[PDB]
Amino acid sequence: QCVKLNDGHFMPVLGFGTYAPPEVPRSKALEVTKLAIEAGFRHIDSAHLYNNEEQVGLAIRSKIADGSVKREDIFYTSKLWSTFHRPELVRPALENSLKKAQLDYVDLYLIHSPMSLKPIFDIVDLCTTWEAMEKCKDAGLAKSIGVSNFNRRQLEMILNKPGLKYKPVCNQVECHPYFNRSKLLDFCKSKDIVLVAYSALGSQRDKRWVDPNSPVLLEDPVLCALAKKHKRTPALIALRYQLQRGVVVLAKSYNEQRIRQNVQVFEFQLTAEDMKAIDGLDRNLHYFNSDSFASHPNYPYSDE
Numbered sequence: 001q002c003v004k005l006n007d008g009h010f011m012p013v014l015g016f017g018t019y020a021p022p023e024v025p026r027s028k029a030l031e032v033t034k035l036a037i038e039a040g041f042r043h044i045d046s047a048h049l050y051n052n053e054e055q056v057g058l059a060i061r062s063k064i065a066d067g068s069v070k071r072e073d074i075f076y077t078s079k080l081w082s083t084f085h086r087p088e089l090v091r092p093a094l095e096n097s098l099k100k101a102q103l104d105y106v107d108l109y110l111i112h113s114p115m116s117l118k119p120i121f122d123i124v125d126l127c128t129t130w131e132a133m134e135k136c137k138d139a140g141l142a143k144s145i146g147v148s149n150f151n152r153r154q155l156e157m158i159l160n161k162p163g164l165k166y167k168p169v170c171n172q173v174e175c176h177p178y179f180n181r182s183k184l185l186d187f188c189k190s191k192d193i194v195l196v197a198y199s200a201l202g203s204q205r206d207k208r209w210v211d212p213n214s215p216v217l218l219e220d221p222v223l224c225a226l227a228k229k230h231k232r233t234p235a236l237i238a239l240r241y242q243l244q245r246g247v248v249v250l251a252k253s254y255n256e257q258r259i260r261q262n263v264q265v266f267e268f269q270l271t272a273e274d275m276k277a278i279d280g281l282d283r284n285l286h287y288f289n290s291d292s293f294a295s296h297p298n299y300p301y302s303d304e
């Protein structure tokens with residue numbers, strides 16, 4: 001199923017995460033995205049940063065051409081990188097992403113991060129950035145627009161902005177049972193903004209940002225015990241948890257069996273006591289925990 005965004009477009013509640021580290025050959029993105037779509041994923045999440053938009057766009061285009069899906073059946077997201085926050089760079093950045101994927105529009109374009117970087121931090125009025133995002137929606141380059149990695153104060157800046165034309169439709173943020181973002185989620189619901197969860201499975205645990213001493217979400221004993229009870233897997237439990245919270249949930253896998261397993265999130269339900277047990281895991285643990293972000297004046301996790 002899908003969720004009605006606050007601008008009237010619709011978003012599939014489960015999305016495919018397409019990020020892979022640079023040691024994974026770029027042709028895997030084409031292959032796995034084709035698998036995702038065959039498996040039943042209709043929401044595909046990419047970004048300028050992932051250096052995979054040609055491959056992902058080709059995968060979407062390949063599945064339109066062969067007859068499996070229609071463009072308007074696919075919800076494709078891309079993201080504005082933090083070196084392009086200056087308002088005059090926004091539209092050309094988006095048009096670059098589209099030429100790379102060879103598509104006419106993105107369903108969703110997001111400000112990837114509030115932590116501006118020089119075109120080595122930058123200072124930019126993100127309200128100016130949002131104005132340019134708005135014009136990309138008027139132009140039809142993006143059906144919807146939203147933000148990513150914003151905390152409550154940052155989201156409030158946009159929402160309170162003088163003569164705002166469009167609210168962000170979503171805020172895509174790290175969100176999983178160790179960092180469930182309850183309060184931020186409550187804020188979003190009260191504003192008709194969708195929370196989209198990334199690293200819903202614990203992240204890829206990339207050395208560049210994630211301490212390998214951190215606990216592995218999918219080895220959690222409460223997730224394991226729910227997986228045993230439901231006869232599913234800890235991944236499916238963590239994904240189903242989010243849908244029942246009203247959170248749209250991304251799942252990255254580059255494995256043919258796991259990609260298919262993840263669509264089974266629609267085949268079962270957790271009870272109220274399951275949801276409470278999982279809610280009890282929250283431990284203010286964000287996996288991305290890096291000097292590269294932490295020392296930024298607009299670091300989202302300062303207000304915690």
Ligand SMILES: NC(=O)c1ccc[n+]([C@@H]2O[C@H](COP(=O)([O-])OP(=O)(O)OC[C@H]3O[C@@H](n4cnc5c(N)ncnc54)[C@H](OP(=O)(O)O)[C@@H]3O)[C@@H](O)[C@H]2O)c1
Nearest residue numbers: 017018019045198199200201202203204235251252253254
């Ligand atoms: N906006 C942002 O700044 C931001 C930040 C991070 C991520 N994202 C987006 O969100 C996407 C997903 O999050 P992520 O990349 O952090 O990874 P994730 O969805 O948390 O997944 C982490 C690991 O779980 C494994 N997995 C998938 N299904 C599984 C299953 N059924 N059982 C066991 N393991 C399973 C995958 O490994 P295998 O490939 O070996 O299956 C994956 O590497 C990203 O790809 C990207 O699209 C955005």
Ligand SMILES: COc1ccc2cc([C@H](C)C(=O)O)ccc2c1
Nearest residue numbers: 019047049112113149288293300
């Ligand atoms: C909290 O500010 C962040 C945190 C994590 C991030 C992760 C990523 C990766 C490359 C991603 O998958 O998008 C990018 C930007 C991010 C900004």
